[PDB]
Amino acid sequence: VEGAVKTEPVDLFHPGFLNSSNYRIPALFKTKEGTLIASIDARRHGGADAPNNDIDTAVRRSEDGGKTWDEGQIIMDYPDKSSVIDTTLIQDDETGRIFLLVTHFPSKYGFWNAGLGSGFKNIDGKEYLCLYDSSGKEFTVRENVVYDKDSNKTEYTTNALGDLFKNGTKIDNINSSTAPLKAKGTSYINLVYSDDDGKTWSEPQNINFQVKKDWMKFLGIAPGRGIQIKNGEHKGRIVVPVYYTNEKGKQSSAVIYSDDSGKNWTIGESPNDNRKLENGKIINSKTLSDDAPQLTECQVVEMPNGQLKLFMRNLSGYLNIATSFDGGATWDETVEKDTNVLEPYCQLSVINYSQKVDGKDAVIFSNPNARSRSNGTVRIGLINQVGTYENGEPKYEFDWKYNKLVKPGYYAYSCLTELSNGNIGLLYEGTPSEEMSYIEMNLKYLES
């Protein structure tokens, strides 16, 4: 229609960019200063997940609303097939700090074989990263100095990237397959930040000691974006979607969150904790033993009063939505299934939109609208109060009033952002692991 905008796709990441053969897993965010940040996995040996790859994190920036982009940078790179996989972006509006979090595995490890627990040990009230030698003897890293099990200082030291130095000379890296001292083979959550609008980024901080429980095997970022709560008692809280597996390997979603501008993090309960299934069974994420109730990658949005809605990948074939009245600490026992929205067991993106649409608060959603990773569709969902819960809290539902096919054929992971002009940017996997496409759309197009 006249006035509708849907730009022709640009290959924002593609084979050869930064000398990476493959790319996957988009994240897209507009900063407070109006800059667009796009992050992605630079998958260097094909498209596979860890451990069958060597994956680095890459970022591109646009300072002109997505019309032109910078030459890109690699911001995290571990050696010898240790990978960083699945990024998410969020900014703290109060301080201007941008966070990028990612899952990190040592060489040989990934989702399916991650070991139990955080990989940290408490010694006299502080958590310290553990390292193991070939015989399984345990050492700890205390302010980057390696101590043995008797708390004798050794000749070894580390840095934030896991390099291992003997008397100050680098000999290996605790994340490699060859090191004489190795971190535990499991997932770690890494956080980096930028205070200059994405131009420069910190060394990684390993926050597993704050968020990963002893009974979790995998705990990983759910890729895309986080939120900072705008309304209500938890205004300011930074919320980052994650998901984990228990000792039986079964997946449950949750969020991690920070109330002190990203300095410290907490994991909330899962919607699987005290969840009431359709057959009436009350489950929890620590004991979940069946595949059907699994809840995996997720993204979160906020309702007008601050209530949170967690949109989750799951095994039902349709969208699942959880509700939190306490800022992501816990969730209501009923996970809703929205049979208006197919969910083929793939990541989805959902964001709040800043302007009312047809007199209602709205969200924008993107996923493959099919029983497979295809038919990529962007939707506008209008928020209505439909009633209350028995506890008196408002009960909200979505009306998926506008649904637009944007990508015929292959469509997998994606990430949305609202742009400064009120339009919508979208970075999507329109190929399995090669070209990652960026488009800008206006509401006239999405409604047409």
Ligand SMILES: CC(=O)N[C@H]1[C@H]([C@H](O)[C@H](O)CO)OC(C(=O)O)=C[C@@H]1O
């Ligand atoms: C850490 C990791 O492996 N992430 C991968 C994730 C995961 O394998 C699945 O969620 C496990 O159930 O899946 C996929 C996928 O295309 O489906 C891509 C992610 O990069």
Ligand SMILES: [Ca+2]
């Ligand atoms: Ca690497």
Ligand SMILES: [Mg+2]
């Ligand atoms: Mg463009």
Ligand SMILES: [Mg+2]
């Ligand atoms: Mg090496």
Ligand SMILES: [Mg+2]
């Ligand atoms: Mg080797």
Ligand SMILES: [Mg+2]
């Ligand atoms: Mg609950």
